[PDB]
Amino acid sequence: ARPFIPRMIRTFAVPIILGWLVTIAVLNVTVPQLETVGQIQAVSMSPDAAPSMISMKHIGKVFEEGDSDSAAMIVLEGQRPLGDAAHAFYDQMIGRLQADTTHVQSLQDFWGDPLTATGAQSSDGKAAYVQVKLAGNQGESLANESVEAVKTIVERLAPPPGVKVYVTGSAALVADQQQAGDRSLQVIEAVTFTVIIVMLLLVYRSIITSAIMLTMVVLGLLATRGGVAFLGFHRIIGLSTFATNLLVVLAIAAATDYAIFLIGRYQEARGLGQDRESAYYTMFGGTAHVVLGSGLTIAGATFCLSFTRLPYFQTLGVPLAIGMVIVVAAALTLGPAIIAVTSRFGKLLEPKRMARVRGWRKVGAAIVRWPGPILVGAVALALVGLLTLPGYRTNYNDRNYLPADLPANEGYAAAERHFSQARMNPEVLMVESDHDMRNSADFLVINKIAKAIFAVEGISRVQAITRPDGKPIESFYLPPEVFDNPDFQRGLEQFLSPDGHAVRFIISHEGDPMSQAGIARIAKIKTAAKEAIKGTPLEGSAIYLGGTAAMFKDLSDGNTYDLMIAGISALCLIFIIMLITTRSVVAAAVIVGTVVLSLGASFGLSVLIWQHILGIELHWLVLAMAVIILLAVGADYNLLLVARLKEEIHAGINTGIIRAMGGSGSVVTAAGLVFAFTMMSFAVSELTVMAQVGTTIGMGLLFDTLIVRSFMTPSIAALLGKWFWWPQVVRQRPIPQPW
Amino acid sequence: SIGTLKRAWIPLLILVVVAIAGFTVQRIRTF
């Protein structure tokens, strides 16, 4: 008769609604927001096992310069060659900086020393720079507050006339990028809201029904946000800003999906001509299991995403698993209750001017009669998408993905006008032996090392105790009596280790250090050093390479392996859920193949639009987040459609396909279009990374919904006929009935 | 007997799929 659950949710509608309201109210009043919690508990970006991180820690430890990877630069430029007033300002500057202890752990003073001043100053004399090491590893808020403090110390004191002073380096870039992101979510949000409302009014052509659906979406979003914030507030689970962003977006995606599913099924059932109660019961009985399966499979995949070895993904599984659980519970309990109470009260959820299921039954008729031609056409478009994929390059330079008005950007530009290299992103190489290096022989070997590293293709400057300015292009000899010179002693304390068991070289690249070539160069640097020390009494020593390029190389390798892990796990879970819901191995295999093909085609299309035509290469976060969202949403839609098809296969397979189309193609297409265009509204955004992600996801869903899912999968089903349900046995058409 | 190997094909197929996926993921994690 009336199953237990639907009645238990219908009779007690008002108590459940009030319970949810009070729970969300408490959760959002007694706890800060998601973004603030993520701020107070940021986590490092570079995994501890990365050789770059280990090398930076060890270099800091041996030279007693701190245990953090963060750094920043201060650059002085003037319209006239820097003079003695500049020197006085700079000396007072370093004094003031080193006065602080809780923010600046150590400072590297070259320009003051006349020995190395030639290497620390531009060729034409109009610029200079210094490196200060901050506190708090990359991605942590400690580094942000430290760099803010250094910036205020910089701006407090008045410089001489005709010289400006800027703060630069990676630390400034990340900090001010975060500030820019904070300040760049107002106009794009306005346009997003207006596009959402127009699209809803287009789908429903009513104002009350769009209002109810938005009510459901917003209550679900508030519930998930409050719950995750509460759980993370008491240090139960770890969070990060990246996790919060993805959690918000995925929450909206899932909430709107389930809301439109329930409303559309109820509306269709009403259209078939039933009363206001049986319609509720049929929509529940036809959609609840689909919602439950979709939500749990997404939660399982996202949880398995926590088995990787890259902080961007490892710290990301548990928050989304719990968020998706909360969203599912809300959509299952509050949803049906709200539809029930709204429909009982009066006439609010009614269908009018129906013209969608007719058109979709027509396309069903087209897709059942001639599956061959339609399938080949869809495959042709997919191949048009796929062929652009193999030519695809990534960019690690985050500088040119931000507006040009950031202060860090202007300091960079001022650095680029007088310097012929990328001196704002150096590297450090360290060789550690088991004996003192403070004598002539090891100095000759050090010169050999420096010369060998210099001759690498694309290494412009290499600074060493032998050649302080960075051009080791001669024969050399250091007599053993120069160690008595106090200036040489400051040089030694700068480069050699205090105990005398190490040396370090400061290496600056050509062009852009964070492009593909810059990433590839570091392995060559390491090999060159190793071959330079081979055969000399320093043979077999330890080589540590620290910097940003090493960080990004190791990050890229981790990214590749982690993407493979996540892909395998997600595809297995999708296979399992398809097999459970439809009880066929062929159907699950076909759906998995279609998903893989669709992701490939959509990402190829995005590469075509952005890399080739517009001429700007994609970031890599784009790949990661695009694949995550596309996988989840596609799994949801595929599962609903296959379940609906399985429902009405008894009166033949052709009639079943056309009815499943006319019944659920409209719903899936409405949901896909709404979310796709809501994600396309991010194009007008100023920030390029988020605009790229929005466009990639929007185009992906448009291609998925309008071609791969509306023409290609039903065509395969109709073509394969009764072998789409193997090993189950099905008849391709029932026994003929008498007229 | 066939009874236990044709009534329990879905659970065993799921177990073998999970087994191979877990093995390969554990092998990948050490890279």
Question: Could you characterize what this model shows?
Answer:
This is part of a larger assembly, with chains A (739 residues) and B (31 residues). With 739 residues, chain A is of the alpha+beta class. The longest helix of chain A has 34 residues. The radius of gyration of chain A is 31 Å and the shape is elongated. The interface between A and B is medium-sized, with 15 and 11 residues.
Give the oligomeric state: part of a larger assembly
Helix content, binned percent of chain A: 55-70%
Strand content of chain B: under 5%
The description of the largest β-sheet of chain A is: 4 strands, antiparallel
Terminal-residue CA separation of chain B: 43 Å
Secondary-structure element order of chain B, N to C: HH
State the end-to-end CA separation of chain A. 33 Å
The number of E-state strands of chain B comes to 0
Question: What is this structure, in a nutshell?
Answer:
The structure is cut from a larger assembly and holds chains A (739 residues) and B (31 residues). Chain A is α+β, with helices and mostly antiparallel strands and 739 residues long. Helices cover 63% and strands 6% of the residues of chain A.
